[PDB]
Amino acid sequence: LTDLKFRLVRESFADAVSWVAKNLPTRPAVPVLSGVLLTGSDEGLTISGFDYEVSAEVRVPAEIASPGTVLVSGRLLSDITRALPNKPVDFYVDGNRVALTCGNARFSLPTMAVEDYPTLPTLPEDTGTLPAELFSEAIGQVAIAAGRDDTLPMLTGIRVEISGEKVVLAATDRFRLAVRELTWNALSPDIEAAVLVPAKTLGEAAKANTDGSEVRLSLGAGMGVGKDGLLGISGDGKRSTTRLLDAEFPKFRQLLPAEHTAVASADVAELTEAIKLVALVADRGAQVRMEFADGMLRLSAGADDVGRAEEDIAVEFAGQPLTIAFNPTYLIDGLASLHSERVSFGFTTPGKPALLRPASAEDRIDQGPFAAVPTDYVYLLMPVRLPG
Amino acid sequence: LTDLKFRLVRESFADAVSWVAKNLPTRPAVPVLSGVLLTGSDEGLTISGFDYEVSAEVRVPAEIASPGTVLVSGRLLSDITRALPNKPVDFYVDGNRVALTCGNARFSLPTMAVEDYPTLPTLPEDTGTLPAELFSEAIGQVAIAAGRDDTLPMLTGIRVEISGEKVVLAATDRFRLAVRELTWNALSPDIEAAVLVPAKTLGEAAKANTDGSEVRLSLGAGMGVGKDGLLGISGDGKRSTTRLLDAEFPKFRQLLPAEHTAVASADVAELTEAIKLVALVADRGAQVRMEFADGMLRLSAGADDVGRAEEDIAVEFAGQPLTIAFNPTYLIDGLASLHSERVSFGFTTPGKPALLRPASAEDRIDQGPFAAVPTDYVYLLMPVRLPG
């Protein structure tokens, strides 16, 4: 009579549990860390997961016939609720077991020790909001450039700078650097702060947290912005926290060139296919070579031992002709982050990084040198050394 | 002037090479075994692969401007030709290299030693034909039951029995046995033979060799049927051979029960979903339990340590009530091979194999025992022992 009992629609329950249980660990130090908390009250069901680094909570409406809290296996519950019949799900605790009935199917699941489950962290005070679309695009553009080596933790984060209504996101692995600037709705107009957030987690909290709604970011307020060690992300009845990274981000502003000795533009899709096609003869995704001259670009790869490949594509180009080589995965990564019809290229040496930035079908381009065009997105890519 | 040179449409070339190169080995003892032979003559291009066990050849039309033969890397050529522009492909040999041009893309591939490539085997004389659909369905129904352990080679084959216009296919791994009977168009009406063919290869030579055409099977003629050690499969400008298996198939006819103590029918899709749903609490795909009584079936799984699951579904049933357990993967395998709306079940002991066979929505079913109904497809499944 005092144990959790409720009923709700299957698809909502299935979605809520799977969103929370995706974050969960399959290899759990403490076994309780594989559970999800289920809490019922006031015509709503709350589902919570914590692993010490990321926490996640979701509230969905439910017909709560009695209130309480229970801890059950997150992935098992996720699996069952997705495979159940599309019919109302009944769930009630019976001491040390949970009863899940739905149509003519009946489950009896064991419970876990709620008492041993870690307390979920409190989200900081709110700092600003921005559309979910925008937050999803910006994080994905930048996160692709972060390092994936925990021995170098200064590279594994996404830097978040706030200056009033303007936000700058940056990530780098020493070989590419991605910087995205955007405007948000700030709660206070006087914030002047920067934090560092793990890229793998923050990329996730946007790659599928996309919807049509608003995203609220919670870092603190006034003097306390950043100082709780957490970033909160909210919207759509979902709340997550992410432990902040303690490392120092590199001073990346030095690396952005103010001037180019050659500039170029190409069709992003055309250029992506040509890279992928010529890279089929490269040794081990070694390198793709780009030859720029007089309104054309020749992409090439290979050696005489495995095979060679060339494709000529139309580009716009100004400056002295140049050949420059890149890791083809890193180049495609940058092109795929631009989200524009065309790419604009900024070159200096074949031994200094190239600037990639988005361009429209209506942007156009004198021997130079050519000033850098201000852009909300930039992808700085280091070249690789040509054979010989 | 005497080297291979031709032109043909990209999609045809890409399809021909990839069909031949799928069979190829990536870890090649002899390095030449990773090549594909390309032979041009008389407005047609022939593409050949051999690995000593399976050979494959395809002829597609092409504008042969000069005849010859060359050996090039099968998977590289497969990769390039699929990614090329949908535009006419030009291919010509230039000594120790091959030139592949297509639109504005140009490849230079090294050749291999044709002289070292093994001679492809000669297909036996033809034995019979049958529709590609039918050959694809029958092989897939039976192959699912073959063993996958080369230490027991008598189980890794598909038995092919021919008796005039009738063909019987059989496979077993000691735990399930699948038997399929079919009618074909025999070349001679007097054949009386059986061979054994590796199931993994023969399953493949049907799973994607499907089309709308006729399949010709080449095992020999008269006295010589089976005696060349090869099965040939032809149709649609494609020719493949498969080395025959040397092991003895088990005498499977003994295992087919003539009589049942209980019979049952169920909806195949409904029963498949219930198995999959209840099996989510099983230990390690351990077992699903089936309780039969009075027009109902209760499926269940689990133990009190992980969780338990039950679903009740409507079935038709005659005989004394019975509970019987099965490996759920093996049961779903059999149900998925029936290709009918319903399944008919034939039981004896909970310690002797159950018979599964297809049934329509218009087949129907007295205390028994009940005679076995003649069927073109049968799937004999061994039960597992209930806990306790």
PDB file of N, CA and C in Angstrom, chain A residues 76 79-80 83-85 97 104-110 277-278 280-281 298 303-312, chain B residues 76 79-80 83-85 97 104-110 277-278 280-281 298 303-312:
ATOM      1  N   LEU A  76      17.952  -4.004 -18.507  1.00  0.00           N
ATOM      2  CA  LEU A  76      16.854  -4.965 -18.574  1.00  0.00           C
ATOM      3  C   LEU A  76      15.513  -4.263 -18.733  1.00  0.00           C
ATOM      4  N   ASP A  79      15.312  -2.880 -22.191  1.00  0.00           N
ATOM      5  CA  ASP A  79      15.014  -3.934 -23.162  1.00  0.00           C
ATOM      6  C   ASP A  79      13.554  -4.373 -23.100  1.00  0.00           C
ATOM      7  N   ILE A  80      13.030  -4.616 -21.894  1.00  0.00           N
ATOM      8  CA  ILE A  80      11.659  -5.115 -21.764  1.00  0.00           C
ATOM      9  C   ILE A  80      10.667  -4.085 -22.287  1.00  0.00           C
ATOM     10  N   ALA A  83      10.267  -3.839 -26.029  1.00  0.00           N
ATOM     11  CA  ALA A  83       9.709  -5.024 -26.666  1.00  0.00           C
ATOM     12  C   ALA A  83       8.293  -5.360 -26.204  1.00  0.00           C
ATOM     13  N   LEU A  84       7.736  -4.614 -25.249  1.00  0.00           N
ATOM     14  CA  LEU A  84       6.411  -4.904 -24.721  1.00  0.00           C
ATOM     15  C   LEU A  84       5.342  -4.605 -25.769  1.00  0.00           C
ATOM     16  N   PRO A  85       4.116  -5.099 -25.562  1.00  0.00           N
ATOM     17  CA  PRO A  85       3.021  -4.745 -26.476  1.00  0.00           C
ATOM     18  C   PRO A  85       2.619  -3.291 -26.298  1.00  0.00           C
ATOM     19  N   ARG A  97      10.582  -7.404  -5.104  1.00  0.00           N
ATOM     20  CA  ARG A  97      10.386  -7.641  -6.526  1.00  0.00           C
ATOM     21  C   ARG A  97       9.433  -6.605  -7.103  1.00  0.00           C
ATOM     22  N   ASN A 104      -0.949  -9.335 -22.351  1.00  0.00           N
ATOM     23  CA  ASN A 104      -0.907 -10.669 -21.765  1.00  0.00           C
ATOM     24  C   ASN A 104       0.509 -11.098 -21.377  1.00  0.00           C
ATOM     25  N   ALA A 105       1.433 -10.150 -21.217  1.00  0.00           N
ATOM     26  CA  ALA A 105       2.796 -10.448 -20.785  1.00  0.00           C
ATOM     27  C   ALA A 105       3.039  -9.947 -19.364  1.00  0.00           C
ATOM     28  N   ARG A 106       3.764 -10.746 -18.581  1.00  0.00           N
ATOM     29  CA  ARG A 106       3.960 -10.481 -17.162  1.00  0.00           C
ATOM     30  C   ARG A 106       5.419 -10.700 -16.804  1.00  0.00           C
ATOM     31  N   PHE A 107       6.037  -9.688 -16.202  1.00  0.00           N
ATOM     32  CA  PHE A 107       7.419  -9.745 -15.756  1.00  0.00           C
ATOM     33  C   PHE A 107       7.505  -9.597 -14.249  1.00  0.00           C
ATOM     34  N   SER A 108       8.438 -10.329 -13.661  1.00  0.00           N
ATOM     35  CA  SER A 108       8.782 -10.202 -12.255  1.00  0.00           C
ATOM     36  C   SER A 108      10.273  -9.910 -12.193  1.00  0.00           C
ATOM     37  N   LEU A 109      10.631  -8.664 -11.863  1.00  0.00           N
ATOM     38  CA  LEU A 109      12.026  -8.237 -11.794  1.00  0.00           C
ATOM     39  C   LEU A 109      12.456  -8.030 -10.348  1.00  0.00           C
ATOM     40  N   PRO A 110      13.691  -8.394 -10.010  1.00  0.00           N
ATOM     41  CA  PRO A 110      14.203  -8.133  -8.662  1.00  0.00           C
ATOM     42  C   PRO A 110      14.582  -6.677  -8.490  1.00  0.00           C
ATOM     43  N   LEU A 277      37.082   8.922 -53.023  1.00  0.00           N
ATOM     44  CA  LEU A 277      37.326   8.047 -54.159  1.00  0.00           C
ATOM     45  C   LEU A 277      38.827   7.870 -54.380  1.00  0.00           C
ATOM     46  N   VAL A 278      39.585   8.967 -54.338  1.00  0.00           N
ATOM     47  CA  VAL A 278      41.028   8.847 -54.549  1.00  0.00           C
ATOM     48  C   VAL A 278      41.693   8.180 -53.351  1.00  0.00           C
ATOM     49  N   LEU A 280      40.993   5.618 -51.874  1.00  0.00           N
ATOM     50  CA  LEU A 280      40.937   4.164 -51.940  1.00  0.00           C
ATOM     51  C   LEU A 280      42.283   3.518 -52.288  1.00  0.00           C
ATOM     52  N   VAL A 281      43.241   4.258 -52.843  1.00  0.00           N
ATOM     53  CA  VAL A 281      44.552   3.676 -53.123  1.00  0.00           C
ATOM     54  C   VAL A 281      45.602   4.137 -52.120  1.00  0.00           C
ATOM     55  N   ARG A 298      43.512  19.403 -58.466  1.00  0.00           N
ATOM     56  CA  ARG A 298      43.776  17.992 -58.728  1.00  0.00           C
ATOM     57  C   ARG A 298      44.035  17.310 -57.389  1.00  0.00           C
ATOM     58  N   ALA A 303      50.771   5.251 -54.124  1.00  0.00           N
ATOM     59  CA  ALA A 303      52.136   5.097 -54.591  1.00  0.00           C
ATOM     60  C   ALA A 303      52.139   3.998 -55.646  1.00  0.00           C
ATOM     61  N   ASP A 304      53.248   3.888 -56.376  1.00  0.00           N
ATOM     62  CA  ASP A 304      53.289   2.954 -57.495  1.00  0.00           C
ATOM     63  C   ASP A 304      53.186   1.496 -57.058  1.00  0.00           C
ATOM     64  N   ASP A 305      53.331   1.206 -55.765  1.00  0.00           N
ATOM     65  CA  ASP A 305      53.300  -0.172 -55.291  1.00  0.00           C
ATOM     66  C   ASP A 305      51.880  -0.698 -55.113  1.00  0.00           C
ATOM     67  N   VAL A 306      50.937   0.164 -54.733  1.00  0.00           N
ATOM     68  CA  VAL A 306      49.554  -0.224 -54.508  1.00  0.00           C
ATOM     69  C   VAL A 306      48.638   0.296 -55.609  1.00  0.00           C
ATOM     70  N   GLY A 307      48.880   1.501 -56.083  1.00  0.00           N
ATOM     71  CA  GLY A 307      48.051   2.116 -57.097  1.00  0.00           C
ATOM     72  C   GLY A 307      47.987   3.604 -56.866  1.00  0.00           C
ATOM     73  N   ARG A 308      47.679   4.334 -57.928  1.00  0.00           N
ATOM     74  CA  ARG A 308      47.594   5.781 -57.853  1.00  0.00           C
ATOM     75  C   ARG A 308      46.237   6.243 -58.350  1.00  0.00           C
ATOM     76  N   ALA A 309      45.830   7.420 -57.896  1.00  0.00           N
ATOM     77  CA  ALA A 309      44.508   7.935 -58.213  1.00  0.00           C
ATOM     78  C   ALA A 309      44.557   9.452 -58.302  1.00  0.00           C
ATOM     79  N   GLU A 310      43.808  10.006 -59.247  1.00  0.00           N
ATOM     80  CA  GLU A 310      43.724  11.441 -59.442  1.00  0.00           C
ATOM     81  C   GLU A 310      42.293  11.788 -59.785  1.00  0.00           C
ATOM     82  N   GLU A 311      41.830  12.929 -59.302  1.00  0.00           N
ATOM     83  CA  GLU A 311      40.620  13.508 -59.860  1.00  0.00           C
ATOM     84  C   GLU A 311      40.791  15.014 -59.952  1.00  0.00           C
ATOM     85  N   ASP A 312      40.387  15.571 -61.085  1.00  0.00           N
ATOM     86  CA  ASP A 312      40.406  17.008 -61.313  1.00  0.00           C
ATOM     87  C   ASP A 312      39.002  17.551 -61.071  1.00  0.00           C
TER      88      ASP A 312
ATOM     89  N   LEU B  76      40.291  -4.103 -54.331  1.00  0.00           N
ATOM     90  CA  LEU B  76      40.564  -2.740 -54.780  1.00  0.00           C
ATOM     91  C   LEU B  76      39.715  -2.376 -55.990  1.00  0.00           C
ATOM     92  N   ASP B  79      36.186  -1.941 -54.861  1.00  0.00           N
ATOM     93  CA  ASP B  79      36.004  -0.653 -54.192  1.00  0.00           C
ATOM     94  C   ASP B  79      35.981   0.508 -55.181  1.00  0.00           C
ATOM     95  N   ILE B  80      36.933   0.543 -56.119  1.00  0.00           N
ATOM     96  CA  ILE B  80      37.017   1.669 -57.053  1.00  0.00           C
ATOM     97  C   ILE B  80      35.772   1.729 -57.928  1.00  0.00           C
ATOM     98  N   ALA B  83      32.660   3.193 -56.380  1.00  0.00           N
ATOM     99  CA  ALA B  83      32.753   4.605 -56.034  1.00  0.00           C
ATOM    100  C   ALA B  83      32.986   5.518 -57.236  1.00  0.00           C
ATOM    101  N   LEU B  84      33.145   4.966 -58.440  1.00  0.00           N
ATOM    102  CA  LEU B  84      33.421   5.767 -59.623  1.00  0.00           C
ATOM    103  C   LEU B  84      32.193   6.586 -60.010  1.00  0.00           C
ATOM    104  N   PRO B  85      32.367   7.593 -60.874  1.00  0.00           N
ATOM    105  CA  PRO B  85      31.204   8.340 -61.372  1.00  0.00           C
ATOM    106  C   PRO B  85      30.378   7.483 -62.317  1.00  0.00           C
ATOM    107  N   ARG B  97      50.932  -2.297 -65.690  1.00  0.00           N
ATOM    108  CA  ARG B  97      49.938  -1.481 -65.012  1.00  0.00           C
ATOM    109  C   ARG B  97      48.656  -1.427 -65.831  1.00  0.00           C
ATOM    110  N   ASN B 104      36.210  12.425 -64.849  1.00  0.00           N
ATOM    111  CA  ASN B 104      37.469  13.124 -64.623  1.00  0.00           C
ATOM    112  C   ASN B 104      38.347  12.436 -63.577  1.00  0.00           C
ATOM    113  N   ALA B 105      38.114  11.152 -63.305  1.00  0.00           N
ATOM    114  CA  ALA B 105      38.935  10.385 -62.372  1.00  0.00           C
ATOM    115  C   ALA B 105      39.782   9.353 -63.112  1.00  0.00           C
ATOM    116  N   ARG B 106      41.027   9.192 -62.664  1.00  0.00           N
ATOM    117  CA  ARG B 106      42.003   8.357 -63.351  1.00  0.00           C
ATOM    118  C   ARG B 106      42.742   7.504 -62.335  1.00  0.00           C
ATOM    119  N   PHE B 107      42.740   6.193 -62.553  1.00  0.00           N
ATOM    120  CA  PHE B 107      43.432   5.239 -61.702  1.00  0.00           C
ATOM    121  C   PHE B 107      44.521   4.519 -62.475  1.00  0.00           C
ATOM    122  N   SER B 108      45.623   4.260 -61.791  1.00  0.00           N
ATOM    123  CA  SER B 108      46.705   3.438 -62.305  1.00  0.00           C
ATOM    124  C   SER B 108      46.919   2.314 -61.302  1.00  0.00           C
ATOM    125  N   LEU B 109      46.508   1.094 -61.665  1.00  0.00           N
ATOM    126  CA  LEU B 109      46.624  -0.069 -60.790  1.00  0.00           C
ATOM    127  C   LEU B 109      47.710  -1.014 -61.289  1.00  0.00           C
ATOM    128  N   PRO B 110      48.469  -1.622 -60.381  1.00  0.00           N
ATOM    129  CA  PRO B 110      49.464  -2.617 -60.786  1.00  0.00           C
ATOM    130  C   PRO B 110      48.812  -3.939 -61.130  1.00  0.00           C
ATOM    131  N   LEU B 277      10.426 -11.800 -26.524  1.00  0.00           N
ATOM    132  CA  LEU B 277      10.133 -10.901 -25.418  1.00  0.00           C
ATOM    133  C   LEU B 277      10.413 -11.591 -24.084  1.00  0.00           C
ATOM    134  N   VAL B 278       9.961 -12.837 -23.935  1.00  0.00           N
ATOM    135  CA  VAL B 278      10.201 -13.538 -22.672  1.00  0.00           C
ATOM    136  C   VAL B 278      11.673 -13.911 -22.535  1.00  0.00           C
ATOM    137  N   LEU B 280      14.180 -12.230 -22.883  1.00  0.00           N
ATOM    138  CA  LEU B 280      14.987 -11.141 -22.347  1.00  0.00           C
ATOM    139  C   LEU B 280      15.414 -11.360 -20.891  1.00  0.00           C
ATOM    140  N   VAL B 281      14.763 -12.249 -20.144  1.00  0.00           N
ATOM    141  CA  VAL B 281      15.197 -12.517 -18.774  1.00  0.00           C
ATOM    142  C   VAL B 281      15.931 -13.847 -18.662  1.00  0.00           C
ATOM    143  N   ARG B 298       1.444 -21.037 -22.676  1.00  0.00           N
ATOM    144  CA  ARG B 298       2.147 -20.097 -21.809  1.00  0.00           C
ATOM    145  C   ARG B 298       3.642 -20.270 -22.052  1.00  0.00           C
ATOM    146  N   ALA B 303      14.907 -16.981 -14.068  1.00  0.00           N
ATOM    147  CA  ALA B 303      14.952 -17.514 -12.719  1.00  0.00           C
ATOM    148  C   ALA B 303      14.801 -16.343 -11.757  1.00  0.00           C
ATOM    149  N   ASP B 304      14.560 -16.656 -10.485  1.00  0.00           N
ATOM    150  CA  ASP B 304      14.270 -15.600  -9.522  1.00  0.00           C
ATOM    151  C   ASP B 304      15.454 -14.669  -9.283  1.00  0.00           C
ATOM    152  N   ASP B 305      16.654 -15.034  -9.735  1.00  0.00           N
ATOM    153  CA  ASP B 305      17.835 -14.217  -9.490  1.00  0.00           C
ATOM    154  C   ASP B 305      17.962 -13.060 -10.476  1.00  0.00           C
ATOM    155  N   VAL B 306      17.522 -13.249 -11.721  1.00  0.00           N
ATOM    156  CA  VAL B 306      17.611 -12.231 -12.755  1.00  0.00           C
ATOM    157  C   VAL B 306      16.246 -11.639 -13.079  1.00  0.00           C
ATOM    158  N   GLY B 307      15.215 -12.459 -13.097  1.00  0.00           N
ATOM    159  CA  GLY B 307      13.880 -12.020 -13.437  1.00  0.00           C
ATOM    160  C   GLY B 307      13.151 -13.121 -14.163  1.00  0.00           C
ATOM    161  N   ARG B 308      11.829 -13.057 -14.120  1.00  0.00           N
ATOM    162  CA  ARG B 308      11.001 -14.060 -14.766  1.00  0.00           C
ATOM    163  C   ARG B 308      10.032 -13.389 -15.722  1.00  0.00           C
ATOM    164  N   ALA B 309       9.583 -14.149 -16.711  1.00  0.00           N
ATOM    165  CA  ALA B 309       8.729 -13.604 -17.753  1.00  0.00           C
ATOM    166  C   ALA B 309       7.765 -14.675 -18.236  1.00  0.00           C
ATOM    167  N   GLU B 310       6.537 -14.265 -18.527  1.00  0.00           N
ATOM    168  CA  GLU B 310       5.508 -15.158 -19.027  1.00  0.00           C
ATOM    169  C   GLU B 310       4.710 -14.419 -20.077  1.00  0.00           C
ATOM    170  N   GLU B 311       4.292 -15.131 -21.111  1.00  0.00           N
ATOM    171  CA  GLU B 311       3.240 -14.609 -21.966  1.00  0.00           C
ATOM    172  C   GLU B 311       2.307 -15.743 -22.350  1.00  0.00           C
ATOM    173  N   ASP B 312       1.012 -15.472 -22.280  1.00  0.00           N
ATOM    174  CA  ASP B 312      -0.019 -16.415 -22.684  1.00  0.00           C
ATOM    175  C   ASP B 312      -0.479 -16.050 -24.091  1.00  0.00           C
TER     176      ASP B 312
END
